[PDB]
Amino acid sequence: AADRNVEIWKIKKLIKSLEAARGNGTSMISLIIPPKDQISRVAKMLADEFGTASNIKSRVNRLSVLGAITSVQQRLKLYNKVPPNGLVVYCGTIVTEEGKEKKVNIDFEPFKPINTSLYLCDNKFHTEALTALLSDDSKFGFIVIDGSGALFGTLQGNTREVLHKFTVDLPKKHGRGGQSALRFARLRMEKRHNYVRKVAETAVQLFISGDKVNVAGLVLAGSADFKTELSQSDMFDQRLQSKVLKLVDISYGGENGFNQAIELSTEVLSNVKFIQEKKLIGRYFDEISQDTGKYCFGVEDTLKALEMGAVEILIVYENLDIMRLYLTPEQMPLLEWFANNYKKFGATLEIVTDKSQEGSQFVKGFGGIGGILRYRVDFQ
Amino acid sequence: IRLPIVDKYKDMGTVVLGKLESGSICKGQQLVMMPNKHNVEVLGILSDDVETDTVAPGENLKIRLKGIEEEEILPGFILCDPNNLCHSGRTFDAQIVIIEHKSIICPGYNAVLHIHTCIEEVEITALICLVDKKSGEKSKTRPRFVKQDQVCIARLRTAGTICLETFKDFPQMGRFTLRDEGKTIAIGKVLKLVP
Numbered sequence: 046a047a048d049r050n051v052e053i054w055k056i057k058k059l060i061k062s063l064e065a066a067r068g069n070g071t072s073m074i075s076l077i078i079p080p081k082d083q084i085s086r087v088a089k090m091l092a093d094e095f096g097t098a099s100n101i102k103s104r105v106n107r108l109s110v111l112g113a114i115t116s117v118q119q120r121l122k123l124y125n126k127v128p129p130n131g132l133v134v135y136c137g138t139i140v141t142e143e144g145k146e147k148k149v150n151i152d153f154e155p156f157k158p159i160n161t162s163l164y165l166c167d168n169k170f171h172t173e174a175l176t177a178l179l180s181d182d183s184k185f186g187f188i189v190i191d192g193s194g195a196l197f198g199t200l201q202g203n204t205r206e207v208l209h210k211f212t213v214d215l216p217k218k219h220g221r222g223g224q225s226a227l228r229f230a231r232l233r234m235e236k237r238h239n240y241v242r243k244v245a246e247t248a249v250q251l252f253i254s255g256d257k258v259n260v261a262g263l264v265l266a267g268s269a270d271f272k273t274e275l276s277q278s279d280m281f282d283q284r285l286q287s288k289v290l291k292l293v294d295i296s297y298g299g300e301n302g303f304n305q306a307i308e309l310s311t312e313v314l315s316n317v318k319f320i321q322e323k324k325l326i327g328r329y330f331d332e333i334s335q336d337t338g339k340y341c342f343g344v345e346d347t348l349k350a351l352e353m354g355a356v357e358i359l360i361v362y363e364n365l366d367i368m369r370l371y372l373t374p375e376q377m378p379l380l381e382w383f384a385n386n387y388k389k390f391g392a393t394l395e396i397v398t399d400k401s402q403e404g405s406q407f408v409k410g411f412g413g414i415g416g417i418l419r420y421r422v423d424f425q
Numbered sequence: 426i427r428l429p430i431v432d433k434y435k436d437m438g439t440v441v442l443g444k445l446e447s448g449s450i451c452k453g454q455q456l457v458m459m460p461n462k463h464n465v466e467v468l469g470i471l472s473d474d475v476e477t478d479t480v481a482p483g484e485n486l487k488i489r490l491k492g493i494e495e496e497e498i499l500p501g502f503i504l505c506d507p508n509n510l511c512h513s514g515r516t517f518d519a520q521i522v523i524i525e526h527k528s529i530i531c532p533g534y535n536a537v538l539h540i541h542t543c544i545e546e547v548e549i550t551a552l553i554c555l556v557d558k559k560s561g562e563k564s565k566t567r568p569r570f571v572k573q574d575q576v577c578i579a580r581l582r583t584a585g586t587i588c589l590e591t592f593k594d595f596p597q598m599g600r601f602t603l604r605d606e607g608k609t610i611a612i613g614k615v616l617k618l619v620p
C-alpha cells in the first residue's frame with residue numbers, strides 16, 4: 046500500500062507543477078488516451094490535426110503547434126499498444142525565469158486505470174482530469190436521527206447514497222378533554238425508547254456486515270438528544286460506537302438534514318488520510334523518546350544511513366528545500382529522487398505534510414527528512 | 426493593582442469573581458479591564474462573604490460592576506488600574522520543565538496554557554537554550570527537541586491575547602502550566618515578554 050501512497054504524491058506533484066507551466070501561443074497539448082482505445086488511431090487523428098494546423102495563418106503560433114504535435118506523436122511511438130490503464134501525455138515548451146525555455150515531454154501510465162479521453166491545446170496543460178486519479182476514497186456512513194423518521198446513508202468520495210429509512214408516528218397528537226399527560230409519557234417515553242432500539246438495530250444491519258464494519262466513518266446527526274441518546278445506549282455499541290468521527294446537531298432530518306450532515310461533516314473526514322501519517326511519526330518520535338533509537342534526522346544522517354544497511358522507514362515531508370551536494374534556494378527535487386528509487390535502498394518511504402501536530406513538528410523541528418533506522422547507529 | 430477574574434455572571438446586574446492579587450480596591454472608584462482597556466466602575470464588593478468598601482489583597486472578591494459591555498467579560502481578564510495597568514501578550518520566552526510527559530516536545534508543539542485565570546490555547550514556537558541543572562548553566566545552541574525531565578527556555582504564542590506579566594516581575598501573573606490532555610505535561614515560568 047505504501048508504494049501507491051508515493052504514487053499519489055508523484056501525481057499530486059505533477060498536477061501542481063504543471064499549473065506553474067504556462068507557455069505562449071497554442072503550443073501546449075494535453076493528451077489522455079483511455080484504455081481499450083488504440084494508439085495508431087489516436088496517432089492517426091494527430092496527423093489529421095497536424096493536417097489542419099498546417100494552415101493556422103499565425104506564423105509563430107503555427108510552427109509551434111506543429112512542433113508540439115510532432116513532439117507528442119514522437120513520444121507516442123515509444124508505445125506500441127495502449128497500456129492497460131491508459132496513456133497520459135503532455136507536450137509543449139514553457140517559458141521560465143530569465144526567459145529561458147524547456148521542452149516538456151510527459152507520458153506515463155496511471156497508478157490506476159485512467160478512463161476518459163482528451164486531446165486539447167491551450168496555453169497550459171489540462172490536469173483537471175488527472176485530479177480524478179486522486180479520489181482514492183473510503184466509504185463513510187451517516188445516521189440521521191429525527192423527531193420522526195431516521196435515515197441511513199453513505200458518503201464515499203463524492204457519491205451520497207441513501208440506504209434505508211423508515212418514518213415513525215410517536216403519538217405526538219394530543220387531546221382536549223380525555224387524554225392524560227400520563228398517557229403522553231407512558232406510551233411516548235417508550236416509543237422514543239423503542240425507536241432508538243430500531244435505529245441501532247438498522248445501524249448494525251447496515252454498517253457492520255460480517256464480523257466487522259464495512260464503513261470507516263459514521264457521522265451521527267440528529268435533533269435534540271437523539272445521538273447522545275443512541276450513542277449512549279446499551280443497544281448501540283460494538284465497533285460502531287468506536288467508529289464515530291463527528292456529531293452534528295441538526296434541526297432538520299431525513300434527506301434534508303443528511304445533506305446538512307455532510308456539509309457540516311466535511312471538516313473531520315479529511316483526517317483519515319491524516320491518521321496513518323500521525324501513526325507513522327509516532328514510532329519515529331518514540332525512538333527519540335528512548336535511549337535506543339534506530340532513528341535518524343537531517344540530510345546527512347538519513348542519506349548515508351539509507352545508503353548502507355537500510356533504514357526500514359524513510360520519512361520525508363512532501364515539500365522540500367533540498368535538491369540533487371544538496372542545495373536549497375541557495376544558488377531534481379530530493380524527495381522526487383527518493384520516490385524513483387527508495388525501494389532499492391531498504392524498503393518503503395512515507396511522505397508527510399506539515400498539517401498535523403506531528404507533521405507540524407517533523408517539518409518545523411527535524412528537517413522534514415529522516416528515518417526510523419533498522420538497528421544501532423554509531424554517530425560522529 | 427491586580428484582580429484575575431475567575432467568574433462572570435448576570436445576577437443583580439453584572440458580577441465578577443476573583444482573588445485580589447495586588448493593590449487595594451475601593452468601593453465605586455473606577456477600574457479598567459484587560460486586555461481591552463475596558464472602562465468600569467465598582468458598584469459593590471463582597472470580600473470573603475459580607476460586603477466591604479475598601480478591600481486589600483488576599484480577599485476573595487465578588488464585585489457588582491457597571492460598564493460598557495457586560496457579559497462580554499471572560500474568565501482570564503485582570504481587573505487593573507485606570508491609569509498605570511497591566512501589560513498583555515501574545516508572545517513571550519519562558520523557562521519550561523518538562524514533567525509528566527512522557528514522550529517528546531519539539532518546536533510547534535501545542536497545548537493549553539494555564540497562567541492566572543486566563544486559560545488560552547498556545548503553541549511553543551522555537552526552543553532557545555536547554556538550561557542545565559548544573560550551576561544553573563544555560564545551553565549553547567538550540568535543541569530540536571526537549572525530552573522529559575529536561576529544562577529549557579522557549580518561545581510561546583497565545584491564540585489571541587493573554588494579559589501577561591513576567592514571573593520575575595509579578596509572579597502571580599507568571600507561574601504557568603502547559604496542560605495537555607489531563608497530564609500536566611510541563612511547568613512554565615515567564616521570563617521575556619516579546620514585545
Ligand SMILES: Nc1ncnc2c1ncn2[C@@H]1O[C@H](COP(=O)(O)OP(=O)(O)OP(=O)(O)O)[C@@H](O)[C@H]1O
Nearest residue numbers: 080081130156157158159160161177180181182183
Ligand atoms: N465512468 C466510469 N466511472 C467509474 N468506473 C468505471 C467507469 N467506466 C468503467 N469503469 C470501471 O470501473 C473500475 C473502476 O471503478 P471502481 O468504482 O470499481 O473503482 P474501485 O472500486 O476503486 O476499483 P479500482 O481500484 O480497480 O479502480 C474500472 O476497472 C473500470 O473498468
